[PDB]
Amino acid sequence: RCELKLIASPGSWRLYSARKIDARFKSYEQKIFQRDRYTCQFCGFQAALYQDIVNLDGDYTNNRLSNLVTACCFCAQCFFVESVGVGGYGGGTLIYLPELTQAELNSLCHVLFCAITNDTGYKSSAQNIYRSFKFRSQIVEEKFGEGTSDPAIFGQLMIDSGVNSEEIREKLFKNIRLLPSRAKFRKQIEKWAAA
Amino acid sequence: EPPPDDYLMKLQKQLASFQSILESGDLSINKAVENEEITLISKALKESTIVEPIERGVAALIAFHGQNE
Numbered sequence: 190r191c192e193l194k195l196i197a198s199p200g201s202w203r204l205y206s207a208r209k210i211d212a213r214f215k216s217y218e219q220k221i222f223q224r225d226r227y228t229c230q231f232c233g234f235q236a237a238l239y240q241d242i243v244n245l246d247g248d249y250t251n252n253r254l255s256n257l258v259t260a261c262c263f264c265a266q267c268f269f270v271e272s273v274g275v276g277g278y279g280g281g282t283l284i285y286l287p288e289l290t291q292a293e294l295n296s297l298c299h300v301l302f303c304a305i306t307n308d309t310g311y312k313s314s315a316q317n318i319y320r321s322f323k324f325r326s327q328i329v330e331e332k333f334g335e336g337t338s339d340p341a342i343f344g345q346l347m348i349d350s351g352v353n354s355e356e357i358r359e360k361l362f363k364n365i366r367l368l369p370s371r372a373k374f375r376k377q378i379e380k381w382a383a384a
Numbered sequence: 385e386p387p388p389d390d391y392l393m394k395l396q397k398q399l400a401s402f403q404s405i406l407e408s409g410d411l412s413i414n415k416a417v418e419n420e421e422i423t424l425i426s427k428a429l430k431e432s433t434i435v436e437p438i439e440r441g442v443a444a445l446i447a448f449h450g451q452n453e
């Protein structure tokens with residue numbers, strides 16, 4: 190059980206995004222996938238396709254294997270709040286959800302989205318839950334202002350305000366979760382079921 | 385596609401609001417809330433004896449559906 194947190198930083202995503210097309214990276218990328226049994230080390234979701242590599246210390250210049258863990262895309266994007274939904278990178282909404290941890294929400298959303306794309310009888314229940322989650326974005330905007338449930342906006346506000354310390358970041362994100370976007374992940378959700 | 389030209393002034397405005405929150409010493413949302421569907425799925429996840437998380441969510445959704453009903 191690795192620790193999920195919401196991180197907004199000026200340049201981590203750029204290092205992480207550039208590493209992803211580096212050739213030396215694709216070498217050891219498969220080593221991490223194999224070591225972790227293609228399993229997200231934050232929520233437990235398993236898949237052969239679309240898994241990501243995140244860095245435990247948040248430092249994307251430190252790519253020794255003991256700092257790298259497999260992460261699904263719902264969990265990976267938590268470490269790049271400011272980039273979520275920017276340039277086609279993932280997608281999500283910040284919500285006030287003290288009732289679930291981020292990891293619990295992410296593993297549940299994998300279950301909900303599969304139940305919605307492949308109805309066996311639980312699509313309606315799954316939609317009802319996801320919609321109640323998404324409704325909780327309004328409490329975030331009542332606190333921080335209109336539009337700020339958009340993670341790209343919220344994360345840019347923190348970065349441009351110079352928010353540096355862990356103590357301040359913890360308070361701002363207290364009981365806030367990044368709810369992954371079923372719409373933006375439709376390609377992944379469907380391909381995970383066929384594959 | 386290009387954002388509306390009030391973008392820069394809206395950003396500076398939004399930042400000034402965010403800034404006063406930063407200075408208030410009241411940084412978190414501390415709200416008491418209750419949604420029946422969120423309560424039910426959280427209660428099912430909490431009371432589960434299933435260890436693996438994807439399987440725990442699978443069983444919790446089923447128990448949700450049966451209890452909702």
Ligand SMILES: [Zn+2]
Pocket residue numbers: 229230231232233234260261262263264265295296
């Ligand atoms: Zn995950």
